[PDB]
Design a protein around this nucleic acid. Sequence first.
RNA 1: AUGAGCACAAAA
RNA 2: CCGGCCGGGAACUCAAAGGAGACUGCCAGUGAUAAACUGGAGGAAGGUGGGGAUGACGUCAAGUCAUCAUGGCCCUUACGACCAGGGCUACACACGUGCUACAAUGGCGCAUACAAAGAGAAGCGACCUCGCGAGAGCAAGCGGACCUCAUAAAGUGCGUCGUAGUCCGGAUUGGAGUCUGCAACUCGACUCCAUGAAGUCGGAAUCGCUAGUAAUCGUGGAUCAGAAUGCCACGGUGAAUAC
RNA 3: AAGAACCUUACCUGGUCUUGACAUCCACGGAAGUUUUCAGAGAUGAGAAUGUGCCUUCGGGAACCGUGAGACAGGUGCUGC
Lengths: 59, 206, 79, 98, 127, 96
Amino acid sequence: RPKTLFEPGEMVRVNDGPFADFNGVVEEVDYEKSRLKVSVSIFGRATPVELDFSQVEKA
Amino acid sequence: GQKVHPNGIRLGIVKPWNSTWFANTKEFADNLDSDFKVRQYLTKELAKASVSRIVIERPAKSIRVTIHTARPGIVIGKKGEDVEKLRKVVADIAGVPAQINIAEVRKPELDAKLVADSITSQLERRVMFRRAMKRAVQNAMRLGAKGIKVEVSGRLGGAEIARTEWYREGRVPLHTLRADIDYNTSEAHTTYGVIGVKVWIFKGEI
Amino acid sequence: RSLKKGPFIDLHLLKKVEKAVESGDKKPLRTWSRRSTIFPNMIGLTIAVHNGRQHVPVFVTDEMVGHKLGEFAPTRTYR
Amino acid sequence: RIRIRLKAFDHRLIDQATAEIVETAKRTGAQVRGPIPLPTRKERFTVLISPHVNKDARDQYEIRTHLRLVDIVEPTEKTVDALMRLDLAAGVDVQISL
Amino acid sequence: NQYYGTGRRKSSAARVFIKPGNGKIVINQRSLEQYFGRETARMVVRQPLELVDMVEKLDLYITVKGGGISGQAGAIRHGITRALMEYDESLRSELRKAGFVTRDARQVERKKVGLRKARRRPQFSKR
Amino acid sequence: AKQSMKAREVKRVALADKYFAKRAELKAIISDVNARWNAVLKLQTLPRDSSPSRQRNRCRQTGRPHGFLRKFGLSRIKVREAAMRGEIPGLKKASW
RNA sequence: AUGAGCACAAAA
RNA sequence: CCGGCCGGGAACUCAAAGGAGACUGCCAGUGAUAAACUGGAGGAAGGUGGGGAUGACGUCAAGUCAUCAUGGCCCUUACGACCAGGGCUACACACGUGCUACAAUGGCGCAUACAAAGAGAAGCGACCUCGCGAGAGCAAGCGGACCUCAUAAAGUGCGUCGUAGUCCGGAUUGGAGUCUGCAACUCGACUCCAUGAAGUCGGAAUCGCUAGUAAUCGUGGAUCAGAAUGCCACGGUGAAUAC
RNA sequence: AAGAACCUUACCUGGUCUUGACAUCCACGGAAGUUUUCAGAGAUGAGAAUGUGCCUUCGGGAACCGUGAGACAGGUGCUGC
């Protein structure tokens, strides 16, 4: 998929994830994990979620 | 040093916490320090407003407080302006956005911080200590709950030897963990030394 | 006891030893660093090592190589 | 296949939060596994009770973090929309994960 | 066909599953003589079967986690008693007379503050 | 109450964070064996007061060096008071 | 077998 | 492919939430026809089931002005402040608390079995390789029921030693190092090679313990760059004795 | 004292600073910050190089830094009788 790589400070959107339809800034990107941490506040608490690069596609 | 803190022993059983947030290992110490700084500033600014309890709940994007005041008109000022300046300065003290919530407390003679602070202000104003704790005990008993005990210790009446003198009415069971006892202390700082106030109030059993 | 990957010598003491060996025989060099391992370059000089209140002079020779400077300066006084 | 773990200092609060999550996941219709309890971390701290010298006189404390996982395995669009502000409690520290 | 016992010591949980069959028994995919037949307390395992006055008629399968050697042996004995409870009801008079129905609640008490152990105080000088 | 001591700890934290993780980690990397030397003699130029080991954990309330607890961030005397008033969340007397 | 003397304001 | 194997009701264990359960509730006797006690049935547990938290009015002018706060007194170009080194680690001695021993229920080598409790992001740090070792190498995983610390040890069989200052004991010392940290002289912790003090169960006196107790065996945490024989917790084996 | 290697330091020898290492008020200015040379045991003292913005009513806002003066700051100094 095009633009599959993400960086700190990039919009994300997951079809099966709950952090879509709201603003999303990622936490950490790890190549050994093959997945990236996304830090979106939930009821005002920042929460990291690990999602596969093919699984999450930016808007 | 015989007696344990009543709030401390029944914190697990009946009394909720003065700070009810969650944090991990890394954020715990700095969250405690921020809570200390915001509570210190609120108490310093609102000692004339006589706040009893400052309940702090942090979502961990912002921080909200539930401050308890006998006169909410003093803390809101005019049209919420004093609340607005206090919210802004407590926000840029804490380094994180803030929401201030104020709960009007009922029975100010039946809550212990304001009883102890009133006795402290009377010892600043050199009211005699026997009349101070006698009025506190009789007013709490006529206004409400069936337990009252006020202990005032240290340099009583300008003496060179400190004494501990306590009045008590009703029933105040400290050993029963079912009891609703609120313990709060306040220190009065006279010209000849410092003098401490210990107040128990027993609401009932839960 | 130290690591094999590096011996230790203070930079100011090393540069003063360099000045002493390019000058020749000179006044005792005053050092406050007892931590420094002496060297074959420092073998021969007459520098003075401080121990608390007073500085003692030490004439470094070939038997003292891996030892620090402060082994020859006594810290305490008994009897 | 998002699995949501949640921890709190209070067992009643984490019970209410987990009940809210399973009710929201079950009103729209989603296959969610039962809320399993992970073991609680019991942090024993042990402090002296006196300012000066009293070694035997010494106090003992505890932090009990109650950790739970709600175990969602079916994703639905109304579910992933409705997980936003679910627990709504300051004590509950929820974490979305795959 | 399978009769189950809970089997706890205060440190070890011995799930015992008894069937009718061969009298040879298996403790954690391993024979009892391999498990602690080199040690003692094989007889305390055999005692609930010895109270029924026959051993060979039943086949016992045992899994046990936790504890030490005698703790696992006692938990196994407790599990065999509860599995014989699932077997029959008339055995309870003999098992209760032998006292094997009860559970051992003698745990280890915690180390108390100011003492080197649970009970042991440090040495005391009057001076 | 120990104003100079707390000032020295603040200055130590500031100087260590300024001069560390930009030079000291590289000097330690060159000090480590690659998987006397001119490289290590160039390396031996290190100043002293930037070290992280010179810092000592002091209580934020009182500046007390001894009796510190890291997760609470305070000394034991202050930790007992905050626990008894109910400020440290989840703290309970372990009556076990 | 023995233990210096004073050091208990605590009040309308 | 011995990976407790994978669809898995999830049985069972386990984890933590709501409950049940024990109240002298019964049945005889004693007493006063009273509380209560003695036995037994039942039951997992029986009479406070076991442990813990909880420590009245007060005593000792007991302890802390050095955790903090504070009344009074004092210094305020010096009892304040910043640095380098040294000291708090000294040593003719006396005392308290512990550790290791004086061996044969033991020491040493090989092979093996069974836990609980915890900690981890300036962190715990697999596997593999190198080094006799402590350890060292761009090496995965895990903010944790998964990954790491992490090997439990007394035990069990085998073989050896056969009462010696010993194959008991490890102090001390001299060489060779590893780790940590800006630096291990004063003044660190381990490893290796070598040496092998006293010590043959201890005068007067004296300490703890009534059951999972004492003894004995290991394990983890706090503090902490590093450094416990101290502290705090954890479990394995497991007594003797109360007329 | 749940951790004494100059560093935790209070104690000692020596080199130094006196509105101060830690706060607030006044005036003069300079952003801050970063790199580097000479000494010295370091504290420090002389130099330089780089950067020099968000501003508003260019009031060079406000932090931070330095300098002069007092108000004061500081005390792990004494008395837990």
